[PDB]
Design a protein around this ligand. Structure first.
Ligand SMILES: Nc1nc2c(ncn2[C@@H]2O[C@H](COP(=O)(O)OP(=O)(O)O)[C@@H](O)[C@H]2O)c(=O)[nH]1
Lengths: 440, 90
């Protein structure tokens, strides 16, 4: 076919919005995951009748197959579009996914909100205490500025235009409250099960003239959900930015030496460079770089590579440490750092002195809520008060943190992968923060 | 039916000598209600070092991924650390 650029997408929605079917359908018809199991059920479908079969049927069997645990391919799902190589995530309901959506690999460039057109279903999906809103809120706070809304199950409502319109208005209010601007959001009416407006235009709604959205250069329109994905705007890759490679592991290979491993969040790693390991301050040359099978002449953002260095004991550098260019804004530890915290729903109240564990990139350290600088209006950033005495669910505030152990972090504005963290406590994520200033 | 999630974990060894067959065996020996181990491979990551990449399906309200990662990691002799390679809904 043709060359394509990479983009990440996370699909969120209520437990019955039909997002697993919608997502499954795309990967199926636009990708190649577990094709073997697929080819097994497409041939088996000959039983159902004379051979015909609904894609959803095969998808259904594939799900039961995975539950048995006999499928090959892993959880990393991809699919292409007339322009994009997409790594998608069907947002899990599991609570431990929250941290992973903040400290995990590859932050989404766009989130697709799947909504059920059903009467009672819709209301239940947009609850203020539902998981759907939480995923939306997190996506927003973490900077996912692009969004797509898909009103699914339009078949169950006989494709009535009026019902579609009301859905759009209520959904626009809902996302507006999160912080999204509806005028930039394509509202696509589809049917994950029948395939309407998924990859091809539907024929069950003459009234439907297609979706549309305002952008910095004008208004973009379309008919299908695939088109909406393909319309996602190209994100800015931090290739030219300074090197930042949080360490995941460290090895000691005979005849080789010390070989740390990790992901290049920003910048480029090449052999011949002189790096530094923060917050230790270890400086050495990059002998070489490997990833998977080969050698690489260089590792770009997104690569999980291993590199070798000499004159550096494996007992000097460890997991959570940051690697970077010694001669280009190099990595350093901090005495403290100020961040914007968003308290999520949870049984509690935070106050100065609170010292939970914070997961920042590969770092796992307990930090102290030294000072509650100010409470702020989440969406605008405007200050509501100075030195509040405590924070509760829903609150947004500027907090000054103090790491208990040597730690290295960045201002979200400069190094996104190292300026967002998760606050662990009460067997869950009680808060998400964004670094605004660091005292290096 | 209960809500589930399929997860793929990255289990790293200590070096290029760590018995890889032993690591996965110890991992699979871990029994939890609502947990189902699946496929797994040994993937090279550089310098002859291979990591463990195994899948599993879990019941949200029953299995804790955090506790699971802690349990695996108790195998000091083989496991250096663990990471979530990726995860989806079911
Ligand atoms: N009428 C109708 N039902 C659908 C459609 N897509 C999915 N469903 C059904 O809605 C239910 C929920 O879908 P599912 O993918 O499990 O939702 P999720 O758990 O939120 O991802 C299932 O029983 C599906 O068969 C659709 O377009 N129309």
């Amino acid at each position: 076919g043709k060359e394509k650029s990479h983009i990440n997408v996370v699909v969120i929605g209520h437990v019955d919005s039909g997002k697993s079917t919608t997502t499954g359908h795309l990967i199926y018809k636009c990708g190649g995951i577990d094709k073997r199991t697929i080819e097994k059920f497409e041939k088996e479908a000959a039983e159902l009748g004379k051979g015909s079969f609904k894609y959803a049927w095969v998808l259904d069997k594939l799900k039961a197959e995975r539950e048995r645990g006999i499928t090959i391919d892993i959880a990393l799902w991809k699919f292409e579009t007339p322009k994009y190589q997409v790594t998608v995530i069907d947002a899990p309901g599991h609570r431990d996914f929250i941290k992973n959506m903040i400290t995990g690999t590859s932050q989404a460039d766009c989130a697709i909100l799947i909504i059920a057109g059903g009467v009672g279903e819709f209301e239940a999906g947009i609850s203020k205490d539902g998981q759907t809103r939480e995923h939306a809120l997190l996506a927003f706070t973490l900077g996912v500025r692009q969004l797509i809304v898909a009103v699914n199950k339009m078949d169950s409502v006989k494709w009535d235009e009026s019902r579609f319109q009301e859905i759009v208005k209520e959904t626009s209010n809902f996302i507006k409250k999160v912080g999204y601007n509806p005028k930039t959001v394509p509202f696509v009416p589809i049917s994950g099960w029948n395939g309407d407006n998924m990859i091809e235009a539907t024929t069950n709604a003459p009234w439907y003239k297609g979706w549309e959205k305002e952008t910095k250069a004008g208004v973009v329109k379309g008919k299908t959900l695939l088109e909406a994905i393909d319309a996602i705007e190209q994100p800015s890759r931090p290739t030219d930015k300074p090197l930042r490679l949080p360490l995941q592991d460290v090895y000691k290979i005979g005849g080789i030496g010390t070989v740390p491993v990790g992901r290049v969040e920003t910048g480029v790693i090449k052999p011949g460079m002189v790096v530094t390991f923060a917050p230790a301050g270890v400086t050495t040359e990059v002998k070489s770089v490997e990833m998977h099978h080969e050698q690489l002449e260089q590792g770009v953002p997104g690569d999980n590579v291993g590199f070798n260095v000499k004159n550096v004991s494996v007992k000097e550098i460890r997991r959570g440490n940051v690697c970077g260019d010694a001669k280009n804004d190099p990595p350093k530890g901090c005495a403290s750092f100020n961040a914007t915290v968003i308290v999520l729903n949870h049984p509690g109240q935070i106050s100065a002195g609170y010292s939970p564990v914070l997961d920042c990139h590969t770092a796992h350290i307990a930090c102290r809520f030294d000072e509650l600088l100010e409470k702020n209006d989440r969406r605008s950033g405007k200050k509501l008060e100075d030195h509040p005495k405590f924070l509760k669910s829903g609150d947004a505030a500027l907090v000054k943190f103090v790491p208990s152990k040597p730690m290295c972090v960045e201002a979200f504005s400069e190094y996104p992968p190292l300026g967002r963290f998760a606050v662990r406590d009460m067997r869950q994520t009680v808060a998400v923060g964004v670094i605004k200033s660091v005292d290096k | 039916p209960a809500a589930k999630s399929i997860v793929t974990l990255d289990v790293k060894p200590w070096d290029d000598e760590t018995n890889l067959e032993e690591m996965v065996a110890n991992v699979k020996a871990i029994e939890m209600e609502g947990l189902t181990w699946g496929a797994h491979q040994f993937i090279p990551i550089g310098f002859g070092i291979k990591k463990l990449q195994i899948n599993c399906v879990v019941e949200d309200d029953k299995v804790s991924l955090d506790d699971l990662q802690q349990s695996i990691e108790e195998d000091e002799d083989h496991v250096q650390s663990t990471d979530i390679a990726a995860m989806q809904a079911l």
